[model samples]
Target: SMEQVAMELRLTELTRLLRSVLDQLQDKDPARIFAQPVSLKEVPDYLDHIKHPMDFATMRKRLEAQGYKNLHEFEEDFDLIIDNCMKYNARDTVFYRAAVRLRDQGGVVLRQARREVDSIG
Candidate 1:
């Protein structure tokens, strides 16, 4: 049985977030956007630029609001959760673990589910 669920980040969300960040930083110089890198080695400031607490808090709210999407048994949920502050993002911690586990077990579960579904037809 399912216990709790969180929103999974889609590729669409990734671009959406990037666009938001870029838009917000319109006044700032484009070349000086990122001071450091994060999230798959991209600049952390890409998200850090979204205003303090605004990005992470909004992400948490959005994730809680949308719930999870299981695209191919896993989706890119951590993208948002990664921005959350440690104190407020406990749910994100759990979600992160679940995402990793799902990915780690992906091969076995995919084969098993495929086998069962295949046998049904």
Candidate 2:
């Protein structure tokens, strides 16, 4: 127990940082489209278009499970959520526009979190 305490502290800090970033994204999504997985009946071709589908719900679960090995890995899923939306929905569509806006907003939050994480060492 004592041997793992130091590592646990780092994990705790990282989890808190990632959660803050997640909260910002959820708040910024007015339509709540990114809150859950895309419905197959609603968009039957979503899986065909997006090979890697990512959502805030999945991210939250993974964060709780400590699935991410590092901040960069966590960032990959964060970017994937935006990338999948833009890829599945056309540039002219509302989903694409929302993804663009979220990318801008989330990027700022993520960068700030990254800087804060750097100081944890």
Candidate 3:
């Protein structure tokens, strides 16, 4: 692979420089950066207590899109919910979307509502 010796050195040097820049970016937001995987076993408890069984395919897709390589990357994010579900403003985030889907909607699904929000408004 050393057919182009000088080219290889330049590529390797460029990679090092780019890695340094990424490290700087990560340090700027340690709160959002998690380099280690959280244990996948915590998924159930990390979600709603009533549990509604999340679709693993959907969950993983969303996680990957949001820069998480695996479900375990949500440990700190999960702490946001357990600490204060409403205060952290997670209602609109992927974390909450997953939580809501994995929750039982309500304690009783067919309990009958008085009315719908209506009119397609």
Candidate 4:
């Protein structure tokens, strides 16, 4: 494999683009986590006592009051919800055209948030 010297690769422009993106992403916003992961669902039963995004600030205060190490450990506490009868997108499968629209319209923020979380570790 070492003797096969005909192989070639070039990415000068790609390198520049990646550096530009990194500059845009890195340490640019402390608010990144708050912007990501907006998967929503509903329930048949009442959960009036449960905390959510509205109560998030006070919850953080309580956690910090308890001497939790950092904000990232809270990521594990995210809960998945199952809506037995409801759907946001009624199509059995995500339609391509609708997906394209949704991804740009609202999902872009979610996508950016995922990228930020991906870079954390």
> How high a TM-score does candidate 1 get?
0.22
Clashing pairs for predicted structure model 4, backbone only: none
The better candidate by TM-score, 2 or 3, is 2
Off by over 4 Å in 4: 1-45, 48-55, 70-72, 78-121
TM-scores, in order shown?
A: 0.22, 0.90, 0.32, 0.21
What are the per-residue Cα lDDT tens digits for candidate 3 across 30-92? 343223333358543544443223233333344434443222343333333333333332688
Cα RMSD for predicted model 1: 16.9
- Compose the digit string of candidate 1's lDDT tens values, residues 5-121: 212234345334433432333223223212122343553453444333323334344444533233221223323223333333354575344434433443354455445434632
Alpha-carbon local distance difference test for all models: 0.36, 0.85, 0.36, 0.32
**lDDT tens digits, residue span 5-120, model 4:** 32211133323333343334322323333223333454323233233331224334534343223223332221111121112224454332333343344334435644654564
Best-to-worst lDDT order: 2, 1, 3, 4
Error of 2 at 10 (Å): 1.5
Q: Compare candidates 2 and 4 on TM-score and give the better one.
A: 2
Model 3 CA deviation exceeding 4 Å by range: 1-3, 44-121
